[PDB]
Design a protein around this ligand. Sequence first.
Ligand code: HEA
Ligand code: HEA
Ligand code: CUA
Ligand SMILES: [Cu+2]
Ligand SMILES: [Mg+2]
Ligand code: NA
Ligand SMILES: [Zn+2]
Lengths: 514, 43, 95, 46, 227, 54, 75, 79, 259
Amino acid sequence: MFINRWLFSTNHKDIGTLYLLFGAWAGMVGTALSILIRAELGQPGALLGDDQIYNVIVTAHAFVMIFFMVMPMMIGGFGNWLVPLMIGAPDMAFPRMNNMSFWLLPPSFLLLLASSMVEAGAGTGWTVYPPLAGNLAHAGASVDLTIFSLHLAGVSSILGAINFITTIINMKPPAMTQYQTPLFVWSVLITAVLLLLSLPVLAAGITMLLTDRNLNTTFFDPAGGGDPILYQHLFWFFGHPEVYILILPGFGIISHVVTYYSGKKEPFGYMGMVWAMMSIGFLGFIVWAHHMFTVGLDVDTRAYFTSATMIIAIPTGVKVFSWLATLHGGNIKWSPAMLWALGFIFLFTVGGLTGIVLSNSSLDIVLHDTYYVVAHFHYVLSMGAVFAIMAGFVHWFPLFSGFTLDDTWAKAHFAIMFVGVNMTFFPQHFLGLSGMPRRYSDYPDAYTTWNTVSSMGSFISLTAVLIMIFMIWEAFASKREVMSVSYASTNLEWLHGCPPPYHTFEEPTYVKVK
Amino acid sequence: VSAKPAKTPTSAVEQAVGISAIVVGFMVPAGWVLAHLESYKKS
Amino acid sequence: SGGGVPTDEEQATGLEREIMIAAQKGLDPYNMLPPKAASGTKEDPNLVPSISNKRIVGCICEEDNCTVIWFWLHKGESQRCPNCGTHYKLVPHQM
Amino acid sequence: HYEEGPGKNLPFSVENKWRLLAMMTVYFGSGFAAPFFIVRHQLLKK
Amino acid sequence: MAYPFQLGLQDATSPIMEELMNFHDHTLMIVFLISSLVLYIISLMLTTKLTHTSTMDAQEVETIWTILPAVILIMIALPSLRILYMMDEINNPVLTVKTMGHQWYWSYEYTDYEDLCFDSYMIPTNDLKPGELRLLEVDNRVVLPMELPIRMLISSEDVLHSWAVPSLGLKTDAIPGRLNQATVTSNRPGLFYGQCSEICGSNHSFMPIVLEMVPLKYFENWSASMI
Amino acid sequence: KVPELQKFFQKADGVPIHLKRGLPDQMLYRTTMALTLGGTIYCLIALYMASQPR
Amino acid sequence: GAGANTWRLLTFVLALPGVALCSLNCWMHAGHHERPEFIPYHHLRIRTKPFAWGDGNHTLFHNPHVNPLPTGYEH
Amino acid sequence: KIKNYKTAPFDSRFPNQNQTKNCWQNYLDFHRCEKAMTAKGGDVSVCEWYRRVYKSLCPVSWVSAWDDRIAEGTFPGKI
Amino acid sequence: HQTHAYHMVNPSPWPLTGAFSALLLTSGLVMWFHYNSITLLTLGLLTNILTMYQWWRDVIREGTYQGHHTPIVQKGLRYGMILFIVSEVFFFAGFFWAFYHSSLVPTHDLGGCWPPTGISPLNPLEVPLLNTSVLLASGVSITWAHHSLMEGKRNHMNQALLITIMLGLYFTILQASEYFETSFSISDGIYGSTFFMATGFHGLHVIIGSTFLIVCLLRQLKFHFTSKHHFGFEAAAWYWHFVDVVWLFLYVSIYWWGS
Ligand code: HEA
Ligand code: HEA
Ligand code: CUA
Ligand SMILES: [Cu+2]
Ligand SMILES: [Mg+2]
Ligand code: NA
Ligand SMILES: [Zn+2]
């Protein structure tokens, strides 16, 4: 009864629920790791001792927050719950592959945890650059277990990407075109395209790293003929597509939330949204060597790559200005998800502008691997992706669970979340400009004061997610239902009720061209 | 989104017990392992 | 060397047999092709078949329009599109 | 057939507030307490 | 080197870091401008009671909407490419110094003539002299002449390091089996403090770089003394 | 032999199609799930033993 | 196009006689060479981590007739 | 001569950041000059300048390793 | 009931079982490379082959005996395999990029020339052209097999698929026997590393294609494939054309150019 419903599940809503549960657990694992990092960096001195265990915590924080919080929740959970509901399909095209992708995820998590537990430790950073990740500096089984964790997560997300593209392209009603679908459907289409176009590159790269470790090859060994710059090339050829994967379903979620809670029938410039998402997807593939501006490339190569960053800056500017433009003359309902979306817009603008500052290779000479980079990627990830996850969760928690959250507690949670993240990641700009490098367990005294301030901010964010758990419990402590939802005609997922039944669209939608 | 009146409505005291339960259940293990790091370093 | 390989007019069974048998007479009871008999007036509405008491109807009531609007349509008289007013009527008897 | 309705599409029962509060705090507290015990383990090793 | 409550960059000694600082001020003024646009518009257009929730002309403003961020990105990128080409001139250096990043220490070879080489480890915290800096003082400071073009070839023995001095505007990857080049000049004498920027193990925080820049005659006296 | 397996698999027993043959599918499904549960628990035992040093 | 006998004629003229001719060509060129004299190179025959099969120095397809060990050949 | 050599010059054939090929080709060019004018039998020290180039350009660990492999006879460069 | 023409799947264990099987493969490789244990690795390999056999046998049961395979379903399966093929294109393209970056600029430790000193490369005009011709002949024979399938020929199909399968077996045993008697090993530098990784992964993929051809043959001899609804054989032709154009790129890149 339980085993056939959940362990043997073959519909999209249950797999999306299991995504939401697993990603909440893994996100709180990552939050504990982040509290540990900011506890080491709070006061001068070594609370933990050596930098090896600190690098283990840093790498674990990066992998757990990237591949196990934003990735499964965002793509899998929101796509599986909403994409057959937005396009009017009864299920996914290949539900067994979706179930297999979920059940490959906690093997990858267990392998990552065992990689952390083995006494060598995978303290390399989330870049797994050799010869630090070789069998000399890390002679042991931690790096191999890390590599197989990445293999399992990659196979999971390729299977999910294949399933998503075939269920979006094929399972539409035969009258609707691809430009009549909702925007989140477009975002997960382009996300699945770049996922299966980028993931085998890192699969091959860490396969060759594994054979360099344990099969005596010289792919990246400079004493045998190879060089680690090849590994950097393949890793970042995956890596910048990966962060565009991390941010694109967030774009779809915020577009849906801003369209809904302003009262609009549609986002302003739907063709502009579609064009800019395909432009960002097509153009994230040729910008990778902005992550290697200090490796010693050609000056013409880095000139090309910083021009590529400018031409990838323009279409997301079109998207953010059109997000502003669809707030025009709307009945602005002050929902909590609206506050998450406006915080998304402002803080993602700040993070993108700091990325544009970093995009010049001339200033990337100075600011490479400082905390200015950390402020850039946290202002995009830990604010934009996290705020988009929270906006989608607050907006669709009536749909997933059947109960409505307490909006007063949700507004308080947004307030202390905003204060905590803004006080955490604003002094990191000054620490990067002053010149503290990344991956440091102890700093000189002149970097102390901002570090102290930054540490305090992390604890505030802890309080945020602490009361967030209470919010969820409060919904199940209240059991307040939903009679009705406004604007249910435009949004298809709200039309079967809250929550929708197990079997939906047995009688499918009736839409005609002629 | 319209909301029904609560079928099993909670009061203020039970919500206080809930927030205190979350705080104590999240700060006993992490706070205990952070309360003595030098004991693990063979003091 | 003769035939041997069967054609799918006797070997194919189940739902594939059902759609192949019904689709050779111009009938699509399993909804693979966009429907027909389109007129928005109240005397000749847009007919929709069903097996239940209601169906989700999506209107694209002007061309080159992005957002389809969806509405439930029940039994009885002809309900209208909730922004354009083309008449849709439900005739629930197909199989 | 499986249960349809509010609170029944979830893999855990929500019919009692207190056992579900205990369930949430032990689940998310196990999540929050895993890396701390890992760090205790590599400190206890050497 | 850094002082408490520092907001901006460390100030410049090389010419290159002066142009980098001026370009940083330029691009941060641009970031302040466009952040003011975004913040003032989002504060403006949620604060009205008038409504307009009907069909609107989808394509009637996109030409200015597309050419304003393109022209501001061009205005950013042209001095970016200028200073990008300002680091690859004909150097014609005076001295050539070779650095090798060994496993958590640095090694220095002045071997243009009369081969000299030494090692740089950090002075430990318990063994600091009074007045010195925690985590920033080395055994043997790395002595160079000032206001001269000096070639600096950077590599490492085993793993990836990053030889970085921020106040002189230098940061170059130390890659095993690969010899990268930087040029270093100055305008003031004194001690300049940097440290490693690439992850290199369990003491990655614990390798600093101290560039002591002196006149030429004192550099000659130091080179004769150290051999 | 295909249309008479077609008659066999089009039954309204309510059984899923991987227990529809009766005995042998049930047998190798039971052995497959038993050996993968044993492999998973011996994998966790091996990982916990490898976590500790000598 | 979309024929069936012409593709059988195409394969029975081109594919199998061509593969047989190339098999005869590789049969008349089936001659081994002498063993090259051994130089202890450093980028060839590395040993960083031992192999996980058999002894640990032999590779998976190590034929002792042609493949050398780092310490010379085998007799 | 071209002497009073203060340091290595700016080589226009290799003007980029990477400088492995400069000292590698200069070391093999010194050895090839040595072999060529030992075969010629003349004054082999006239390209002694080339020797000082690899004194100044690539590290003494690399030069010591290359001297060891050319003393044993395991030099991959064709001289 | 059901009025949409899509396929609703019964609850399935092989997601869970194959997922924990992949966990067993990863942990088996870790315990083999570092602790020398075979038993967990072999248990994982047995779990994969049992899971994949059960899964594809049941997909055969839905597609052949229960008739759940609508044209919309076959279009979806076509899209899914095409995406899987494109993923494998980019995997082999990453390996190609590794080899091209390795051989475009040779390093100083190799001596600065490709091939490195101390290795004897395989010249392409000997017996590698035999295996290129074997894969080309197998592609021609499977094209005749596909055309005899659409036309309605049965015994011509059996002869064609039999010669396709035995030439695939000839190709893989010829590659294996050549890699017994190659003059350089995996530890012979970046040339050996790139060459043996690329050819080993292509060998694994061609033995996967040979197994898929064999199960296609034993499906066809039990009259599973009709005159037009024969997506497994279309899949076999697509993956076989994939594997020999990949080998054409390997033979152009590694064997001919630079050797
Ligand atoms: C959400 C994930 C995400 C997103 C969207 C981005 C977006 C961008 N990222 Fe970043 N990035 C990361 C995640 C992300 N990044 C991560 C995780 C790293 C760390 C990798 C490592 O460890 O090294 C990283 C690292 C990273 C570096 C490495 C720095 C270094 O190594 O020293 C650089 C270099 O410039 C960079 C650049 C950019 C740029 C130029 C964009 C752009 O796409 C931003 C554009 C977005 C905007 C919102 C601006 C548009 C708004 C307007 C208002 C229009 C502006 C118009 C004008 C100014 C004219 N990123
Ligand atoms: C998803 C990506 C992500 C996220 C959210 C974060 C979040 C945070 N990060 Fe992280 N960080 C990285 C990705 C991320 N980081 C990466 C990729 C690196 C580089 C690693 C390397 O150097 O190699 C890094 C590095 C990094 C360092 C560098 C350490 C060093 O190099 O010395 C530090 C320390 O200040 C840090 C701090 C923080 C803090 C204080 C937060 C806080 O924001 C934590 C608060 C976050 C949350 C609370 C998550 C929100 C989740 C929920 C609200 C629950 C969701 C559940 C439901 C909705 C049901 N991060
Ligand atoms: Cu050397 Cu960090
Ligand atoms: Cu990037
Ligand atoms: Mg670097
Ligand atoms: Na510390
Ligand atoms: Zn209408």
